[PDB]
Amino acid sequence: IYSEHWSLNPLEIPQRSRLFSLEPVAVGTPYAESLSSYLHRLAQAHCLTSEKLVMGEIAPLILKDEDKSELLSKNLSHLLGNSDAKPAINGMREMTEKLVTVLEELTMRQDLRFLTLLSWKGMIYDKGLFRNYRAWCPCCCEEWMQKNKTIYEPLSWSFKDVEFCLIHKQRLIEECSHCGARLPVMARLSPAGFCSRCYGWLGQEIKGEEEIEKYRVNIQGISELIALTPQLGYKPIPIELTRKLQLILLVFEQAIGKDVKLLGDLGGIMESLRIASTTNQSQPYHLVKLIIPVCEKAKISVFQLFGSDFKELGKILFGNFSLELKL
């Protein structure tokens, strides 16, 4: 006879993700997808509106004590807080924190924290950093759609001090050309590249003919800041950044000691760094107001400042100011 006896018992595979495990686009590069664009992409992949998916799954995990079905028939602002809203949701705010935590738990993904700036909480001041209204680069969207590439909004577009796309040298457009209104970042249905109000198109060959060199340092520094966070491999330590700033201050002081003229070029930044090192270290520092000009005068990229260790940073500073020190 036949000795083979099959067994059809189930195998009990590990629990699957509640939502699709969509990869974030261009993580670690100056063109990383914003959390808002990722939310809209996940909603589009599920054939659900961002609002509807939000109260379907994120709201019960965010809003702890409510009836989930009764939450299914509300406005997005009840949990997002549209009184604030703004592209600042991409920042380091509390609702951003809990939203990122819930999203990472739902898809068991380990990179959504890089799609925002919670890794820089306590490091970079929130005020004066993010735009109040949605912005886009029409050339980017048109090129992406023509090349059959995924549409999304980079983090750089959410910053006030980023107004130009270095790829296309085009000033960011905050107003829909069709309806004339300015889109909020969060809406009931706002797929990337589309007008959240009139459903019109926002990608056109718009030419940028301004002095982009003025804002080049700011945009490149912010791009480096976004692109560097996923590559660190750890949560940054506040006093690490504080002591790097202090080391740059000491290098500045030694350079001034060697050359008196440099005091004229660096006095204001010296005073600002001294104040930032005398105030509480746990207090965040204003990114564009303090760190970017400081590393600019130090002739050091934001990537070099936040990435290199103390030895490399000290050696490069000494070489940059032609000092004879060796740490």
- Nearest approach in angstroms of CB 219 to another protein is 28
* Other CB atoms within 10 Å distance of the CB of residue 240: 14
Residue 34, phi then psi, degrees to nearest 5: -70, 160
- Nearest approach in angstroms of CB 207 to another protein is 31
Burial code (b: 16+ CB inside 10 Å, e: under 16) for 287-298 equals: bbebbbbbbbbb
Q: Do you know the residue count of the chain?
A: 327
- Separation CA 251–CA 257 (nearest Å): 10
Residue 134, phi then psi, degrees to nearest 5: -70, 145
- Nearest approach in angstroms of CB 195 to another protein is 15
- Nearest approach in angstroms of CB 29 to another protein is 22
Nearer to another protein, 30 or 314 (CB): 314
C-alpha to C-alpha distances, 192 to 113, 135, 138, 187, 243, nearest whole angstrom? 20, 11, 11, 11, 40
H-assigned helices in 108-237: 138-146, 213-232
- Separation CA 244–CA 250 (nearest Å): 10
Nearer to another protein, 11 or 260 (CB): 11
Nearer to another protein, 17 or 279 (CB): 17
- Nearest approach in angstroms of CB 199 to another protein is 11
Nearer to another protein, 101 or 281 (CB): 281
Nearer to another protein, 128 or 199 (CB): 199
- Separation CA 273–CA 248 (nearest Å): 9
List residues binding another protein (CB under 8 A): 1-11, 13-14, 16-22, 44-49, 52-53, 56-57, 72, 107-108, 189, 191, 233-234, 237, 239-240, 243-244, 309-311, 314, 327
- Nearest approach in angstroms of CB 139 to another protein is 24
* Cβ 194 vs Cβ 201: under 8 Å: yes
Nearer to another protein, 107 or 119 (CB): 107
Nearer to another protein, 218 or 242 (CB): 242
- Nearest approach in angstroms of CB 90 to another protein is 23
Residue 141 neighbours by CB under 8 Å, 6+ apart: 151, 192, 193, 202, 203
